[PDB]
Amino acid sequence: MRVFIDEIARHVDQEVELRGWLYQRRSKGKIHFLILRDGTGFLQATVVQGEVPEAVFREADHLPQETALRVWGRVREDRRAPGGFELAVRDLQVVSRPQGEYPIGPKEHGIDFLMDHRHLWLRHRRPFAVMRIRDELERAIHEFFGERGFLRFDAPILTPSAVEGTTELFEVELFDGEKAYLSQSGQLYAEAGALAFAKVYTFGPTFRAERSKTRRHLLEFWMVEPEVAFMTHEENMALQEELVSFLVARVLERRSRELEMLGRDPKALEPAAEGHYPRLTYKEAVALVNRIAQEDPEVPPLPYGEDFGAPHEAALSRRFDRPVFVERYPARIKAFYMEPDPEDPELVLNDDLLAPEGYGEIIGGSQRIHDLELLRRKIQEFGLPEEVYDWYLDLRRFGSVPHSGFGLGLERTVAWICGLAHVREAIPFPRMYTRMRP
Amino acid sequence: MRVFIDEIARHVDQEVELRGWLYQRRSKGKIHFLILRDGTGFLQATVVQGEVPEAVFREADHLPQETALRVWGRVREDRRAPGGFELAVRDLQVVSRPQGEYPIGPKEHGIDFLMDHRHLWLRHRRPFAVMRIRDELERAIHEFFGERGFLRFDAPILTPSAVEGTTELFEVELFDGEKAYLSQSGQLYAEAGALAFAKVYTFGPTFRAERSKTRRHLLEFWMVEPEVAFMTHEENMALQEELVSFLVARVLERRSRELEMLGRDPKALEPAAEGHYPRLTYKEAVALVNRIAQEDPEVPPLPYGEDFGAPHEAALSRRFDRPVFVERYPARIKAFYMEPDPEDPELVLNDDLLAPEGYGEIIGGSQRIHDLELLRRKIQEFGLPEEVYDWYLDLRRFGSVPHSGFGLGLERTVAWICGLAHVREAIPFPRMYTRMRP
Ligand SMILES: NC(=O)C[C@H]([NH3+])C(=O)NS(=O)(=O)OC[C@H]1O[C@@H](n2cnc3c(N)ncnc32)[C@H](O)[C@@H]1O
Ligand SMILES: NC(=O)C[C@H]([NH3+])C(=O)NS(=O)(=O)OC[C@H]1O[C@@H](n2cnc3c(N)ncnc32)[C@H](O)[C@@H]1O
Ligand SMILES: [Mg+2]
Ligand SMILES: [Mg+2]
């Protein structure tokens, strides 16, 4: 029967068929050494002369990289093998030979070349591990919220309303000269969903007109955006903590093989899986940065009332063994929808969660304004056209309740967990400022 | 403790708190009749004088529609109640009153008005049932493929490559005058994924520049697009059947309450849940249409070699108690990527699956060309720029294998299962030709 390498362990001492590709080959003496990939793993295959037809054995000398194979043999247990098993080959059929030289040969390549050949690179072990961890998180997100009786609620991609500032917005031409924007966040719609279904979350693509090539920016990425009716600022942070803890615990438990392949230390992720996340006010945070900055001139200082930069977040996150919250920022550097702190009219009830080891923001959230008139002032204070947000105001006119929510950047979470050098490695086909292909 | 109506059954004869909204109210005699919504269901609440403060009882006279409430009471079993239970009210707190009249009052409204107020309409029972069935399918898709060891693989949204014809493509302006297209299908990338991970599927938004307002067209919708290495035309149809069967079985088993609310007969969906889907060649299909057309002048005839229309599909699907396959269409009315039938050079190895009761196409799929030179001819035969598809050609140069896949339109599947009159009712915030708001 045809099996998958993923489950070769439960086919020990049995006749099996594999369908896959030739990853590597060495031919010396009276034995061929093969590594086969099938898409679910990598397995050692040995072709010994006598045990195979001479028509086969001569063919196994002229097999280039990424040759398509069908392979028949018996599975044997062996400690000195990638996985602890091997295939003793008995017969072999070639489905196709490479039409040219395989571009990603046994040489070191620069990231630029690798990303130019991303459609081929995805075959290799490191992307293999990443994509499987991405899959694990995507499944695990659905289970988490399903068990909590949350409803998935797909926010529209085409939108008239801006969410996070007029500065960076893509435009789409429609019919008869009409235009619309590409969603930067589906939050506004998630709120409507919240007042309708109590517990909702979006899980769709989002688009920012970013103009940098930093290790944490893409033009296209995926955002998970929960929203809950009646939920406070405090409850929001607790939920975020519950989520991140579960995700990391799930990766540690089920994807330990993949972590190994990425050379990531599990002991550096266990703390994040166990909750008890530290917590700072913005003020305490700015003060801790200014301490670090005075001891290290590479870390820049931060004047109070100014917005955090990546090095600020980076330095701050290295002080903790797990993600740290930063809360109660000044209203003037935040968003129009954010609820004022009842104690201090300068602050809003928001939070960002920073990933450890220098990674920075993985989540941004807040409590929302529920008072109609307060919202109206905020709109035009931010200089936003009131007309466009009239459906958003309806949510305050009818059935208005306190409510909170956040948005988790999936790529950034993937980069952190896998320990990658850039978010572009965390998605199949990245879209950056200067990278629109393939 | 605060509970949800969704699970009121396991709180019988207990003190509970509800947080929700007033759906309907009638006040006569010495008793108030309430229906409360909380987002997870609808429950009957009774406020009897004496059992409540007089400050509360007088207030329960001036409670408009969609008032925000907190409510304390004991749960009592009662056969004559929506769900089989009620809340005996003891105390009540109002969180907010409507700022104006609630637009969707106890009158009949046209669909145009309802869709203009979609952000409010989502609160009502029929959308409630739809969105919960949509949620059920979205979770169930992930379980199906996860258990089969398939990998979720997110295809890019921004793309240079067209998939289903140059005719209908949106354009996005980027940086420095550059432009890209909105994905109409992520298939091309799913193929790269297939050669890398063997068993993959996308589950993202897709965009067609459709210019009609028919009951099955949107500009924005969600497509599930599996792709498998080594899989034939025959195996493809079997997999599609396996998928649709599971989805419908899952809805029938877990969402029977929601079906009731939509007035959908379960007996009309059971057949689709049990496999054994009928099958036609294109030729046999055209011939059966021409029979129907000759008996009914409302059903139009179909000349052989011409592409099916919605009435053709509609009439055809009514002849079966479950979804029917139509396979082996003429190459000239199909796509560039489709593999030629080895027996007949006029035909390609494709299939469409039609949903019963007049619904029509829910799936479109095929086997793919794996021969490099054959693909090159097809490209420029269709008049497509070879340069743009050079990464697609690489998949034929290196590790090229036979492979097949399909794409399932989620909205159309939702419309069918729920028995809706239009696909716009099957997504939270639809985007049609003349409907871009809210
Ligand atoms: N529903 C909500 O409350 C979300 C909220 N409206 C919002 O969009 N805030 S956020 O932009 O800071 O958060 C977006 C998150 O998404 C990530 N993000 C934000 N921008 C990017 C870019 N350019 N590339 C990759 N990832 C990005 C980052 O992890 C952020 O935490
Ligand atoms: N990966 C693949 O093999 C998919 C393939 N490249 C494809 O796009 N073919 S399809 O357009 O016929 O199928 C798209 C499906 O998606 C649905 N569809 C297709 N177009 C629409 C519109 N405009 N609105 C709503 N739904 C639509 C319909 O159910 C189709 O079966
Ligand atoms: Mg932010
Ligand atoms: Mg089609």
Swiss-Prot record, chains A, B:
Q: Which GO terms describe its cellular component?
A: cytoplasm
Concerning Pfam families, the annotation shows: tRNA-synt_2, tRNA_anti-codon
A GO molecular function held by the record: nucleic acid binding
Report the InterPro entries cross-referenced here: Aa-tRNA-synt_II, aa-tRNA-synth_II, aa-tRNA-synth_II/BPL/LPL, Asn-tRNA-ligase, Asp/Asn-tRNA-synth_IIb, NA-bd_OB-fold, NA-bd_OB_tRNA
Give yes or no: UniProt keyword Cytoplasm: yes
This entry's Enzyme Commission designation comes to: 6.1.1.22
Catalytic reaction annotation: tRNA(Asn) + L-asparagine + ATP = L-asparaginyl-tRNA(Asn) + AMP + diphosphate + H(+)
Q: Which UniProt keywords apply?
A: Aminoacyl-tRNA synthetase, ATP-binding, Cytoplasm, Ligase, Nucleotide-binding, Protein biosynthesis
Q: What is its main location?
A: cytoplasm
Q: Which major enzyme category is it?
A: ligase
Tell me the compartments it is located in.
Cytoplasm
Sorted alphabetically, the Gene Ontology BP terms of this entry are: asparaginyl-tRNA aminoacylation
How is the subunit organization of this protein annotated in UniProt?
Homodimer.
Regarding protein family, the annotation reads: Belongs to the class-II aminoacyl-tRNA synthetase family.
**Protein name listed in UniProt:** Asparagine--tRNA ligase
